[PDB]
Design a protein around this ligand. Structure first.
Ligand SMILES: [Ca+2]
Ligand SMILES: [Ca+2]
Ligand SMILES: [Ca+2]
Ligand SMILES: [Ca+2]
Lengths: 178, 178
């Protein structure tokens, strides 16, 4: 019951996400907008920052999702095992995790606008306190195919960018101490 | 987001649960029958058998429930903090727990027939490998009120019984090594 999430994450340098949305509006199909508030957790005895694991409880437009992510499997894209379940109650799931000994680590909040283009999901991310990013995830795609599509995507829409395989959680920590 | 579960558990000596069901049929309202398969988990570093805690993943008529239970708060009834969430997928939740380091401990399986009588829930339990039990749980009830109702219940229906505050998990372990 596991799945490999493969995506590329771009920090947007120019233009604004609003202007990018205008550029893709006509050829990409809008899916939905998600307001996502994420709580991350650590295990006191198994520093997830050493094993490169993550446990997250997400509220996305009121839907509550518990996610495990495993260590990164690539240096060219952000590739990780991901296991997710929907749960009925966020407060109670958080209570269970804390009763089991997990400790709340950090919180990430964003507005995400999802677009679809031929088995690719393009997410325009406005991250509280971090700024503007784009993620592209592949549906039954090889790493090569994803990398090639992203190169075509940024070129077609004249986006200036920096790629990274750091998570938003990791980028948030870097940003705080600066 | 916590709740105090208070119940009394009876091991039935006589008559059979089938005969007991006949005796209560006319004055107690049938709610439903549940086929419940439970997986229990332990934390390798926090022996739940020492802290008197439990983590359980239940499949009850196909509904999947993750439950935490805290230490017993009474010697006269089985009284414990309980926190529960419904989850979308049992295999994936079990995988998440195992990825986090939890280990599957034991499994309990039963058929449970639930009846209602004036804010009391009477559960007739046929436990695989353990035998026949009755649980009575109180809705906004004091311990005194629950104890008194159970005394009236066993007397009214001529049940021979033994009370216990051991869990089914604990009773299963005792039964195995005999
Ligand atoms: Ca992502
Ligand atoms: Ca993703
Ligand atoms: Ca019980
Ligand atoms: Ca109960």
């Amino acid at each position: 019951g596991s799945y490999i999430e493969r995506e590329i994450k771009l920090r947007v340098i120019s233009p604004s996400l609003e202007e990018i949305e205008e550029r893709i509006r006509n050829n990409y199909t809008f899916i939905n907008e998600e307001h996502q508030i994420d709580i991350y957790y650590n295990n006191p005895i198994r520093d997830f920052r050493k094993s490169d694991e993550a446990l997250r409880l997400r509220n996305t437009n009121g839907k509550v999702i518990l996610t495990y992510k495993g260590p990164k499997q690539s240096k060219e894209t952000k590739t990780r095992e991901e296991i997710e379940v929907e749960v009925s109650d966020l407060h109670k799931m958080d209570l269970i995790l804390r009763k089991l000994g997990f400790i709340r680590s950090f919180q990430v909040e964003k507005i995400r606008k999802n677009y679809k283009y031929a088995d690719f999901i393009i997410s325009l991310d406005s991250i509280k306190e971090l700024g503007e990013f784009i993620e592209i995830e592949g549906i039954n795609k090889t790493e090569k195919e994803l990398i090639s599509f992203v190169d075509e995507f940024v070129k077609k829409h004249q986006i200036q960018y920096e790629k990274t395989i750091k998570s938003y959680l990791e980028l948030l920590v870097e940003h705080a101490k600066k």
